[PDB]
Design an enzyme around this catalytic site. Structure first.
Site, PDB file in Angstrom:
ATOM      1  CD  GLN A  56      -1.742  -0.953   3.383  1.00 36.38           C
ATOM      2  OE1 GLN A  56      -2.047   0.189   3.755  1.00 36.38           O
ATOM      3  NE2 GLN A  56      -2.012  -2.037   4.103  1.00 36.38           N
TER       4      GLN A  56
HETATM    5  N1  LIG Z   1      -8.589 -14.275  -9.415  1.00 36.42           N
HETATM    6  C1  LIG Z   1      -7.320 -14.215  -8.630  1.00 36.42           C
HETATM    7  N2  LIG Z   1      -7.455 -13.456  -7.552  1.00 36.42           N
HETATM    8  C2  LIG Z   1      -6.271 -13.485  -6.940  1.00 36.42           C
HETATM    9  C3  LIG Z   1      -5.200 -14.132  -7.339  1.00 36.42           C
HETATM   10  N3  LIG Z   1      -4.246 -13.838  -6.358  1.00 36.42           N
HETATM   11  C4  LIG Z   1      -4.653 -13.027  -5.354  1.00 36.42           C
HETATM   12  N4  LIG Z   1      -5.963 -12.828  -5.783  1.00 36.42           N
HETATM   13  C5  LIG Z   1      -6.955 -11.941  -5.055  1.00 36.42           C
HETATM   14  O1  LIG Z   1      -6.301 -10.678  -4.874  1.00 36.42           O
HETATM   15  C6  LIG Z   1      -6.544 -10.127  -3.567  1.00 36.42           C
HETATM   16  C7  LIG Z   1      -5.285  -9.474  -2.795  1.00 36.42           C
HETATM   17  O2  LIG Z   1      -4.476 -10.716  -2.657  1.00 36.42           O
HETATM   18  P1  LIG Z   1      -3.281 -10.585  -1.494  1.00 36.42           P
HETATM   19  O3  LIG Z   1      -2.605 -11.871  -1.501  1.00 36.42           O
HETATM   20  O4  LIG Z   1      -3.840 -10.045  -0.168  1.00 36.42           O
HETATM   21  O5  LIG Z   1      -2.377  -9.407  -2.101  1.00 36.42           O
HETATM   22  P2  LIG Z   1      -1.020  -8.810  -1.609  1.00 36.42           P
HETATM   23  O6  LIG Z   1      -0.081  -8.529  -2.797  1.00 36.42           O
HETATM   24  O7  LIG Z   1      -0.490  -9.594  -0.485  1.00 36.42           O
HETATM   25  O8  LIG Z   1      -1.534  -7.353  -1.038  1.00 36.42           O
HETATM   26  P3  LIG Z   1      -0.849  -6.420   0.116  1.00 36.42           P
HETATM   27  O9  LIG Z   1      -0.913  -7.243   1.396  1.00 36.42           O
HETATM   28  O10 LIG Z   1      -1.739  -5.175   0.117  1.00 36.42           O
HETATM   29  O11 LIG Z   1       0.478  -6.105  -0.381  1.00 36.42           O
HETATM   30  C8  LIG Z   1      -7.393 -11.073  -2.901  1.00 36.42           C
HETATM   31  O12 LIG Z   1      -8.741 -10.673  -2.926  1.00 36.42           O
HETATM   32  C9  LIG Z   1      -7.143 -12.516  -3.447  1.00 36.42           C
HETATM   33  O13 LIG Z   1      -8.249 -13.229  -3.471  1.00 36.42           O
HETATM   34  C10 LIG Z   1      -5.068 -14.839  -8.378  1.00 36.42           C
HETATM   35  O14 LIG Z   1      -4.190 -15.520  -8.989  1.00 36.42           O
HETATM   36  N5  LIG Z   1      -6.359 -14.884  -9.146  1.00 36.42           N
END
Ligand SMILES: Nc1nc2c(ncn2[C@@H]2O[C@H](COP(=O)(O)OP(=O)(O)OP(=O)(O)O)[C@@H](O)[C@H]2O)c(=O)[nH]1
Ligand SMILES: [Mg+2]
Lengths: 165, 141
Positions: A56
């Site tokens: 973020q």
């Molecule tokens: N359709 C899909 N949704 C995904 C995929 N990977 C993550 N998501 C969706 O994306 C969202 C954010 O995923 P996170 O794993 O929390 O993302 P992050 O990069 O860790 O985010 P921060 O903690 O803010 O840095 C969620 O709602 C998951 O369901 C994927 O391969 N396909």
């Protein structure tokens, strides 16, 4: 020697879902990372420390406090997020002139391939100007943290590359 | 002294929220800890299923919050059976963001005896100042 992997990208990219799925853990109750999630394990005989850092706006400025002694950086992209694709490009190129990341190996996960409106790797390859990258070794890989598709092919390559140097 | 006061807001602002235990082969949780692991006057405890003594794959996760920023964060973990050592882990996190919640996981690779006699002590340091100390007693099943 233990290897230090550093996982970054914009918030909502898939970083944490990738780190969890990769360890065979559930991904149905993941929430925004408000700090860092570190994972210490063993893969193919390598002793790894994987740092997943919140993406973020607020967290991003602290990214550089973790640059030191990083063996490989994993840059994670939301393949279906054409809206921030240029902010993604900027962040990455900015990462490529960091002096504490020099000679690190770059791996790019074009994540969320399981999504309808997902740009190909070529489109993402083009979008982030990867061809212009000579400072580091890199490789893009499309995948899906949710289905678990093509995560190992990326990590396995990254692992072999770092080891060869 | 301003250092004391600082070294005081650092302590006040740090909280170990939870610990958990997984079967590393499957990725299933065997036990997650509620439970004011930070509170005093309480001997913290884990009622884990005995299967844990059967896996080769055990992973232990921690989750901690810090209101204050810290530059040299590190932890020291030791698992004791009585006076004997079973495992000793170390980790240097270095920098810790202000108002942030962080996680740390490591993968660790008979009963009437073990139950109630196994302790996990996690000591947390900023550089060399002790910020927190936890202790959890293991009860198998
Ligand atoms: N359709 C899909 N949704 C995904 C995929 N990977 C993550 N998501 C969706 O994306 C969202 C954010 O995923 P996170 O794993 O929390 O993302 P992050 O990069 O860790 O985010 P921060 O903690 O803010 O840095 C969620 O709602 C998951 O369901 C994927 O391969 N396909
Ligand atoms: Mg996250």
């Amino acid at each position: 020697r233990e290897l230090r992997l550093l996982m970054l990208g914009l918030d909502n990219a898939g970083k944490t879902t990738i780190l969890k799925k990769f360890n065979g853990e559930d991904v149905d109750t993941i929430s925004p990372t408000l700090g860092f999630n570190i994972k210490t394990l063993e893969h193919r005989g390598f002793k790894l420390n994987i740092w997943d850092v919140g993406g973020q706006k607020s967290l991003r400025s602290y990214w550089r406090n973790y640059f030191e002694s990083t063996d490989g950086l994993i840059w994670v992209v939301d393949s279906a997020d054409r809206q921030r694709m240029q902010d993604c490009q900027r962040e990455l190129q900015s990462l490529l002139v960091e002096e504490r990341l020099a000679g690190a190996t770059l791996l790019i996960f074009a994540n969320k391939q399981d999504l309808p409106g997902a740009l190909s790797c070529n489109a993402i390859q083009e979008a982030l100007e990867l061809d212009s990258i000579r400072s580091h070794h890199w490789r893009i890989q499309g995948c899906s943290a949710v289905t678990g598709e093509d995560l190992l092919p990326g990590i396995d390559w990254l692992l072999d590359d770092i080891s060869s140097r | 002294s301003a250092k004391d006061e600082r070294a005081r807001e650092i302590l006040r602002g740090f909280k170990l929220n939870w610990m958990n235990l997984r079967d590393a082969e499957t990725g299933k949780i065997l036990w997650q800890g509620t439970e004011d692991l930070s509170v005093p006057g309480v001997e913290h405890e884990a009622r884990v299923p005995k299967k844990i003594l059967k896996c080769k794959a055990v992973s232990r996760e921690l989750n901690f919050s810090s209101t204050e920023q810290m530059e040299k964060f590190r932890l020291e973990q030791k698992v004791y059976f009585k006076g004997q050592c079973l495992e000793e882990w170390f980790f240097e996190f270095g920098f810790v963001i202000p108002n942030s919640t962080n996680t740390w996981q490591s993968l660790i690779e008979p009963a009437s005896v073990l139950t109630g006699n196994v302790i996990i002590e996690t000591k947390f340091f900023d550089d060399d100042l002790l910020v927190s100390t936890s202790r959890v007693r293991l009860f198998y099943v």
